[PDB]
Structure formats: structure tokens, C-alpha cells
Ligand SMILES: C[C@@H]1CC(=O)N(C)N=C1c1ccc(NC(=O)N2Cc3cccnc3C2)cc1
């Protein structure tokens with residue numbers, strides 16, 4: 035990795051575009067508010083600080099590599115060799131940068147400063163926005179963690195209404211999205227952002243990232259159970275679906291086992307194969323080792339409601355304290371196809387209307403959880419708010435005529451507790467008046483060293499639901 | 502990187518789920534047909550073969566790391582230590598796998614075999630689908646390359662109608678999506694997939710991936726020009742937008758320069774600042790070094806049409822051979838906000854309706870180009886089609902009752918030229934009859950060695966538009 039090749043091309047030319055005699059460029063990141071995701075989980079910055087920004091990031095070889103590449107890329111010699119050499123010689127290749135950030139796991143309303151960046155050496159005014167591209171990728175873990183947590187709110191609300199408790203809440207949305215993300219690296223980041231809110235994952239890459247960059251008291255942050263795919267059923271031949279089911283549940287008789295049942299006909303599998311032919315292998319299983327039946331095709335709501343109606347008539351169904359129907363403890367369902375925040379809400383409301391407890395079901399989400407997200411969802415944005423030119427500080431901003439929603443904040447920023455216990459961002463250095471107590475941002479990075487870190491345990495505690 | 506921790510958790514348990522006495526598992530990847538992306542660019546497999554699959558991928562330390570992690574992850578000892586040890590001892594940690602693939606750059610209609618995977622050792626039946634997760638991530642570079650190319654078709658069609666040529670087509674869609682993707686790795690893969698079709702990029706990460714894994718005769722596969730951001734304008738102070746514009750165009754007087762002009766009022770910037778105050782610096786510029794005015798806010802179509810109307814009345818507009826209006830060669834426009842395949846089509850059709858040539862404009866796309874894409878768009882899918890159990894080959898498939906569109910192909914597959922010059926996938930080993938030509942799939946991977954490679958130059962040639 036070469037930080038000199040880890041920015042937008044145009045930023046290579048920016049050191050020649052600022053006003054001459056500029057000693058300071060001070061920039062900030064926010065989840066810009068709109069005209070519905072009203073609060074965001076801050077998670078991911080620490081990963082980036084440690085992997086890409088900290089220590090000796092500049093060498094004589096990296097400056098040369100970059101000079102050679104940009105000479106051909108621009109068909110011109112615009113690369114700032116002198117500026118990068120200054121960093122190598124003065125600070126042994128350590129970035130003269132101060133980053134202040136909200137603590138990780140913190141749940142902040144839209145339109146508040148989450149972190150600030152500035153240069154600590156007047157020579158390195160250009161460096162602040164060089165690293166915009168790297169720092170803005172914070173959007174991804176922030177967004178995954180926020181959208182995961184909003185899904186937990188929906189599951190929590192319906193599990194409480196239909197069961198009267200939150201038992202198993204942290205295992206009800208399982209990460210299926212390893213194959214569905216753009217890269218191995220994305221898989222690690224995304225799975226880690228999900229585990230802020232839940233404990234169930236099949237995206238193994240997430241575990242090593244958490245261990246290396248955050249840490250947990252427990253040996254692993256995430257857990258899984260044995261489960262079939264279409265290959266492990268269909269390999270037996272079309273006329274031997276029963277022989278496949280029997281072999282799989284018998285191999286995993288004393289642990290929970292998920293078996294995809296839609297290879298040929300989901301409704302036949304539930305009613306005839308599970309419901310009659312193999313009934314005797316299901317009803318004998320322990321409460322700690324249920325069969326979990328997995329549909330994976332058709333309208334998600336309609337398929338879940340019909341599978342439950344089928345199983346309710348073949349197995350001894352009970353009625354819980356609140357009047358909702360419950361399968362026996364050895365039998366559960368998981369819907370692992372077409373699950374996003376929208377269809378999740380559709381299914382649990384649909385199940386509630388037909389008097390089925392949410393105790394009965396868990397969800398698998400892949401693309402909906404880790405891939406079908408953009409920087410646009412929470413308006414994740416990095417902008418310059420304050421510069422010092424000719425020894426004079428100026429409050430700086432954009433305010434486009436045709437979009438007031440893209441207006442940026444002015445001057446040096448500070449995050450404060452209101453008297454009612456909410457958050458406010460003070461602009462124009464007004465935090466120095468100390469009318470709102472102390473700044474809630476901490477220095478997390480300074481002059482190539484990480485100065486403050488959080489365990490994955492702390493982050494989980496900060497990210498807890500109200501209830 | 503540890504390939505033993507680079508799969509879906511549930512696949513760790515699959516070696517116990519296949520029929521006993523299974524010596525072969527043969528699986529295939531396709532872009533499944535629907536009930537409108539009719540043809541896909543095959544690109545990305547080679548990257549994955551070299552980075553993750555080739556050579557000694559298994560060590561005594563990696564088997565132990567995996568055994569320790571999975572023991573805690575499952576709260577059970579399910580990990581196949583024996584199977585992974587066999588690969589270490591017999592093949593010096595080299596994967597006993599054969600992968601056949603269509604050549605990279607190839608444009609194939611939906612629902613055709615793109616690559617096949619199988620084990621070369623009867624012991625390693627389980628290995629074929631272990632690597633599904635890693636191989637299926639091919640969806641991302643395939644999808645980016647396909648969607649980029651469809652956008653090139655739209656640009657090509659309207660540039661021809663309005664100008665009568667394709668001059669500068671390969672520079673008209675510029676990659677802005679470095680900050681908008683989920684990771685550094687994704688940035689590299691995505692930018693590389695775009696450069697299959699175009700030569701303009703700001704996602705620098707793409708250049709090193711191409712050089713390392715593919716190669717070009719040319720020194721670099723992608724190019725860029727100097728450009729401003731809001732920071733390099735707004736840093737001058739609200740009342741000095743003119744002083745900023747003048748400084749920037751003067752610094753980059755002999756090369757093309759992009760200047761974002763919407764910081765406060767885009768319409769004022771075009772009509773008064775560019776159109777009157779600084780007119781004398783624009784009209785003096787060379788045809789090889791134009792000013793490119795950049796709006797970045799408001800309705801994309803409406804803003805482009807109004808900026809052009811403004812500039813058409815302040816600058817000497819010509820009428821080309823085909824009756825469409827053309828700015829002087831020293832003045833061009835780029836729309837770099839809210840550009841996806843849909844809005845791209847909206848704008849060029851809108852410009853055509855108002856008799857503006859597509860010569861006038863180029864596009865910047867970030868999230869639309871590299872992030873706002875899923876595995877669902879082209880139905881990228883990996884399925885088992887053929888097994889050998891008890892020495893007997895079986896043709897295998899899924900066929901869900903409630904979704905015929907998820908039906909998979911049967912038996913050993915082969916890709917052929919039809920007599921009319923189209924593609925067909927033969928099922929059930931029917932390719933072994935010589936009734937069609939040669940199989941177009943070539944062995945690209947066998948027993949830990951990459952056996953066939955393509956230059957980025959070859960891939961570009963294969964991916965060309967007809968015309
Ligand atoms: C163990 C949890 C808890 C629970 O209460 N229920 C009902 N279900 C659980 C569960 C059910 C199923 C799985 N795993 C799966 O079905 N997988 C794993 C997986 C990964 C990627 C693509 N497809 C699949 C199929 C994982 C956990």
C-alpha cells in the first residue's frame with residue numbers, strides 16, 4: 035500500500051489551487067440531514083487509522099513510484115515531490131495531522147460533526163484534503179452499522195409485542211453477504227459493522243478484523259450453526275431429497291441445523307417429507323438443537339406465511355402469553371432470500387396479522403445487509419470549514435443556490451450535550467465560550483500516532499437500543 | 502490471507518452433507534436469464550486466481566488458526582482438519598482444482614456458462630464449493646464492466662446522431678467513485694473494470710492492479726486532468742470566487758482544467774464570472790487545453806440545459822453538419838453529480854431535444870459507476886450441475902416450484918458458436934458430440950498453477966463495441 039496513490043487524481047493538483055500563504059486547512063465529516071435514518075452509529079475510523087495512516091507511511095521508494103505513475107497519468111509533472119520529501123525528512127514519514135472524533139459505537143442524530151481533520155505543520159496545509167478519499171470510506175462501516183441497528187429496532191418491537199421478551203434478538207438477523215460484496219476487504223469491514231448490533235454471521239472475514247483492530251473479552255464476536263446449500267441436497271439426485279434431509283439432520287443431531295427445503299418444491303418438503311416421512315427425527319430433537327427449515331424462493335412474505343400454516347397443521351402448535359402461535363421448540367424457520375430493511379418490516383407485520391410469534395423465525399440477509407448501500411443513504415460528506423491565510427483565520431463553506439441540503443458548516447466545529455441531553459454542533463469556534471460545557475470529540479490521531487482506541491465490547495455497549 | 506477462513510461458515514460443515522462415496526463435484530457460474538442487461542463482459546477471474554488461489558495456500562499454521570477459530574465460532578469441532586492436511590501432504594498445499602473459463606473481455610448473452618470448477622482428486626470432492634464464496638465475488642468486476650459498457654453504447658449512439666463521429670468517446674465517462682466505494686480493494690477492482698471500456702479515471706488504485714495482474718503495452722491504462730474541489734474555491738472566501746477561478750485557470754493555462762462553479766450560484770458563475778469578468782482568459786485558451794465548467798448540484802438534466810443556454814449566449818456558438826449546437830473548442834461542460842446509467846440516458850436525450858451536440862459534455866460518475874450495483878442485477882450465480890457417486894455420474898440441478906427463473910443447468914457444460922454466430926451452452930455432456938465447434942472454455946487454473954492469462958490490451962479488444 036502507498037498512501038501517495040490512495041487519493042482522487044485531481045487532489046494531486048490541489049496544492050497549486052489554494053490561496054498562497056495558507057498555513058491551515060481544517061475539514062470535517064458529517065451525515066448531512068435531509069428535507070428515514072435520523073441517527074447514525076459511528077464505527078470504522080479506527081480500522082483506517084491503524085491499517086493506512088499510522089507510523090512511517092512515506093518512503094523514498096513510494097515518492098518515486100508515485101512521481102513515475104503521475105507523470106504518465108497526467109502526461110505532465112504536477113506531483114508535489116518537495117511537499118512529500120518534507121514529510122519524509124522532518125517527521126520520518128509520519129503524517130503531521132490531528133484527527134478528533136466522537137467515540138465509536140456512539141449514536142448521533144444527522145447533521146452533527148463526527149470527526150475533524152487538520153494539519154499540525156504550516157508546510158502541510160495540502161495534506162488535510164489529500165486524505166479525504168481514504169477517510170470518507172468511513173461511510174461504509176457507518177452505513178452498514180446504522181442500517182443493521184434500524185433492522186434490530188424493527189425485530190425488537192415485534193418480538194416484544196408477540197412474545198413479551200427479547201430472548202434471541204441478537205441472533206435473529208444473520209449475515210449471509212460474503213459472496214454478495216465487492217471484495218474480501220469489504221466483506222471483513224461489512225461483517226464487523228453488522229456484529230456491532232448482532233452475534234450471528236457466516237462472513238468469517240469479520241472475525242479476524244475485530245480481533246486485530248478492536249478486540250473482545252470473548253474469544254470470537256460472532257457465531258454460526260451447521261447448514262445445507264442446494265449442492266448438498268441436489269447432489270443426492272432429484273428422487274432422493276428425503277435421503278439427503280435424513281443424512282444431514284442425523285449427522286448434526288445434537289446441534290441446531292438449517293436445511294434449505296425449496297430445491298424442487300418447498301410446500302411438499304414441509305408437508306410430506308418433514309411433516310410425515312421424517313417427522314419422527316424432528317420431534318425427538320432437543321430445545322438446544324432444533325431443525326430450522328429454510329425457504330429460498332418465491333414472494334418472501336407469502337412463502338413464510340404458507341410454510342408456517344403447513345407446519346402448524348403437522349406439528350403441535352402452542353399459544354404464548356400474548357395470544358400468538360408458537361411451533362414446538364425443536365422446529366424453527368429462517369427466510370434467507372430477498373431480505374432488506376423493507377421486506378423485513380413487511381414479513382414481521384404480516385406474521386403479526388396472522389397471529390404467528392416472531393419467536394418462530396430468524397432472517398438471513400446478504401446483499402441487503404452488506405452491498406445494497408451507498409454514500410448517498412446518510413449523505414456521508416467531508417468539507418473544509420476553516421483555513422488560515424496570511425495569518426488570518428476565515429470561516430469557509432459551500433451554499434449551492436439549487437440545493438440548500440448541500441450547505442456546509444462554518445469555521446472550527448465542536449460537539450456538545452444540550453441541557454435536555456441531546457447533541458448540538460457549534461460553528462464559528464463558539465465552543466470556546468464554554469456555554470455548552472466540554473467538546474465531546476477526542477483526539478484519536480496526531481503526528482502519525484493513534485492516541486485513543488475502543489474495544490469492540492465498548493462499541494457494542496455504546497450502540498445498545500433504548501428499550 | 503488464509504483461504505481456510507475465506508468461505509461462508511456453513512460450507513465448513515458441507516463435507517459431512519454430500520452423498521457418501523462422492524469422488525467428483527462439478528459446479529458452474531452463469532449470469533442467469535430473466536422473465537435490461539442482455540450481454541455481460543467477463544472480467545475479474547484472473548485477479549482472484551493470482552491473488553488468492555494459486556501456489557501454496559495451505560500451511561500447518563493456517564490449518565491450526567482455522568481449527569482454533571471454528572472451534573469457538575461453532576462451539577463444536579466440525580472443521581475438516583483431515584481433508585486440509587491431505588492437501589498439505591499430497592500437493593504441498595496446492596489446490597487440486599481445474600477451472601475452465603471463457604476468455605476475459607468476451608461479451609456473452611445472459612444464461613451461458615462463463616466458468617466451470619471441479620476437483621482433480623477424488624478425496625477433494627468438498628473443495629469445489631468451498632471456493633464458491635471467493636469465485637462468486639467475480640460478480641463485481643463483471644457487473645461494473647457490463648454497466649460501464651452499456652453506458653458507452655448510449656454515449657456512442659447520441660454522439661453519432663448529433664456529431665456524426667465517436668471522437669473522444671473513450672474519455673466521456675470519467676470514474677469519480679474512489680470515496681464512494683466500500684474499501685481500497687473494491688476501489689482497485691471497480692476502477693479496473695471501468696477501464697475495460699474507457700480511458701478516463703480519478704480512482705488511482707485501478708492503475709496498479711492492471712499493471713500487476715493484467716499489463717498494458719501503453720505505460721498506464723488510464724488518464725486524468727487538473728480539477729478543483731469546493732475546498733480549493735471556498736478557501737478564498739465567499740466574496741473571492743472570481744479570484745479563485747482566475748488563479749486556477751492561470752496555473753493550468755496549457756492543459757485542460759475542470760473548475761467546480763456551483764459553490765454559491767452556478768448560474769451567476771457561468772453568466773457573470775466566466776461569461777463577463779474572466780471571459781478574456783477563456784477565449785484565449787488552446788483547443789488542447791479547454792476550460793471545463795462543472796455543475797455539482799440541482800436536477801442534473803435541468804442544470805445542464807440551463808448552463809448550456811447561459812454559455813451559448815455569452816460565447817460564439819456554431820451549428821455542426823447535423824444541425825446541433827457546439828460551444829467553441831476552448832469551452833466544455835462535465836456533469837459529475839447524480840450520474841447513473843438512467844440519468845446519463847435522461848441528459849443526452851434532453852440535450853438532443855434542445856439541439857445541443859453530445860460533443861459539448863462529458864460525465865463524472867462515482868457511486869452510480871462503482872457502488873450502486875448488486876449480485877442481483879445480472880443474477881450472477883454458482884451451482885453444482887454434475888457429481889460422480891459410487892463411480893456413476895449424475896446430472897443434478899435445482900428447480901424451485903414458485904420461481905422457474907432460479908432453475909439451474911444439468912450435467913457437464915460446454916460453450917459453443919451457433920451456425921449464425923451466436924453462443925449456446927450444451928448440457929448433459931452433449932458437447933462431447935462434435936455437432937458444434939470447439940468448446941470456447943479454456944483451462945485457466947489446474948493443481949495450484951494459472952495455465953492461461955490475458956493482457957489488459959486483449960481484454961479491451963474483446964470488449965469493443967461493434968460499429
Ligand atoms: C442459529 C440461528 C438462530 C435462530 O434462531 N434461527 C431460527 N436460525 C439460525 C440460523 C439459521 C440458518 C443459518 N444459516 C444458513 O441458513 N445459511 C448460511 C448461509 C450463508 C450464506 C448463504 N446461505 C446460507 C445458509 C444460520 C443461523
Ligand SMILES: C[C@@H]1CC(=O)N(C)N=C1c1ccc(NC(=O)N2Cc3cccnc3C2)cc1
Pocket residue numbers: 042043044669672673675676677678701703725726727728729757759760793795833834835837861862863865
Ligand atoms: C478531460 C475530460 C475529457 C472531456 O472531454 N471533458 C469534457 N472533461 C474531462 C474531465 C472533466 C473533469 C475531470 N475531473 C473532475 O471534474 N473531477 C475529479 C473528481 C474526482 C472525484 C470527485 N470529483 C472530481 C472532480 C476530469 C476530466
